[PDB]
């Protein structure tokens with residue numbers, strides 16, 4: 202399956218993301234308004250992927266058009282990237298189960314984790330700047346890249362592209378904040394600690410939201426949603442939980458009309474008597 | 483005996499460092515400090531608690547309690 | 553007497569190991585260490601707390617507090 | 623020996639300050655104070671625990687328990 | 693005075709019995725064990741913490757901290 | 763030395779009252795009493811923990827641990 206993400210305008214970008222979402226996911230019954238929902242990724246076999254052709258880095262121009270991302274469908278993880286000019290698929294070490302036909306596959310030593318990528322890139326995601334200019338630079342880095350081991354500049358490129366594709370697909374918050382960078386004024390998107398926290402809690406959010414039945418709030422670790430517009434303004438696509446489970450078997454507890462991830466509640470309700478704790482050194 | 487079985491209706495930390503719970507319309511207190519977080523957790527997560535004691539009169543003490551998720 | 557009833561607006565750990573909460577626009581502190589995590593749990597979960605004390609002036613101490621769910 | 627592995631079916635605070643859990647249909651008690659809130663939190667989230675003891679009959683004591691992610 | 697305000701970026705217990713938190717890009721430490729569960733609970737629930745001290749500086753000790761849900 | 767950095771695969775309360783966690787395929791124990799609820803909270807929420815100790819072989823002890831949000 203092949204999709205285009207067109208970075209030409211905010212309209213083309215959002216339209217691109219919405220088109221992908223509609224094809225690969227189904228809206229939750231209880232978190233959906235019009236055609237804007239939290240949707241659950243449709244079940245697909247492991248190894249299933251979709252391709253994303255990157256377009257419009259130079260607004261409305263058939264330039265910079267040789268980059269394709271390979272995205273594992275079940276989890277929206279970026280498995281690697283294709284240089285369509287050289288017909289080469291550079292695949293992360295943790296995605297040897299993703300097979301792309303008709304390309305030369307280069308199996309990389311580098312894994313796809315943010316821990317690894319931030320290290321190689323010498324770039325932290327919290328405070329990371331993304332602009333149209335830096336996406337063009339990212340594109341050029343990936344097109345120049347060769348070999349089985351990620352370089353600093355290739356890793357910086359992947360960090361930027363994963364954020365504005367896969368993470369934006371998952372989170373309407375990131376879609377909304379980043380898209381401003383595509384406007385004529387060409388401002389810089391700066392990834393916030395809150396943006397980063399969302400991406401780190403996607404699995405946990407995915408386990409909880411299907412249980413939502415109009416509660417006055419949702420609490421998942423460090424993440425809080427106070428109403429339905431907060432949910433919809435933040436989250437677009439979740440894992441199919443029917444990395445959803447960390448431990449235990451209870452997705453949620455309703456406490457004072459707020460839906461809590463049970464694990465979060467458990468993690469502050471496991472303290473003994475304070476006097477006994479502090480004196481027992 | 484089983485003094486009361488149900489959800490905790492309220493809990494209260496007392497000036498004498500004891501802890502009160504109301505269960506099925508009756509109030510009971512305990513002096514065991516580790517029961518304070520255990521009872522507050524049960525109250526918050528909607529556990530059914532069974533207060534057990536030799537004397538089950540309202541306002542009496544206890545130091546045995548069963549916790550059930552359901 | 554019931555000094556203040558409502559949700560905890562903020563809590564504060566103090567340098568003398570006392571613990572402050574703001575309830576219904578009024579601040580109260582306690583020297584009872586056991587209350588610290590119990591008040592934090594109450595704050596996190598939006599419990600309605602009732603501060604009980606002989607002095608109800610904002611800034612005064614307490615060692616009795618009731619915890620209620622919605 | 624690994625005596626019982628599964629979710630906690632109920633927990634109970636006992637009058638002697640020991641703490642009982644029912645796992646795989648068998649009751650086990652512990653006098654380890656620190657296990658009380660750890661076991662209750664495992665209970666509320668449905669965490670799988672493995673009770674380890676010299677004897678595995680219901681009514682046995684334990685001082686060792688593994689908290690699993692199953 | 694307010695030294696730092698924000699969510700906790702990480703916490704760390706050190707071999708020398710100090711507990712470090714990073715708030716608003718700055719590291720502070722406390723050896724008050726009372727603060728360990730309070731600070732970790734704040735970290736895992738995304739509370740906004742305000743580190744307070746008479747003198748605010750990097751890598752300094754603290755024993756006053758305000759907790760807000762947000 | 764940097765021993766392990768990962769999520770807690772299981773935790774265990776030991777007969778000698780120490781507490782064990784499995785991180786990155788290796789088991790590490792601590793006798794630091796303060797760490798018990800903190801480590802369980804980390805396991806519950808899937809926190810990345812960084813264990814540091816002078817030896818990193820499975821079965822090594824530790825007293826230094828960082829709790830990360832990542």
Ligand SMILES: CO[C@@H]1O[C@H](CO)[C@H](O[C@H]2O[C@H](CO)[C@H](O)[C@H](O)[C@H]2NC(C)=O)[C@H](O)[C@H]1O
Pocket residue numbers: 497498581582583584604605606607612613614615
């Ligand atoms: C007139 O004395 C006042 O009594 C209040 C309670 O009626 C407050 O004292 C209580 O709270 C203190 C701070 O936690 C401390 O624990 C006292 O021991 C406690 N009093 C009793 C009787 O338990 C207030 O601080 C006093 O000024």
Ligand SMILES: CO[C@@H]1O[C@H](CO)[C@H](O[C@H]2O[C@H](CO)[C@H](O)[C@H](O)[C@H]2NC(C)=O)[C@H](O)[C@H]1O
Pocket residue numbers: 564565566567568570572579580581610611612756
């Ligand atoms: C002697 O001064 C009193 O100290 C009390 C604590 O021992 C109370 O102060 C605490 O509670 C206040 C509530 O309005 C406020 O939070 C203060 O910041 C806190 N004190 C310290 C040192 O942090 C009492 O209000 C004082 O009168």
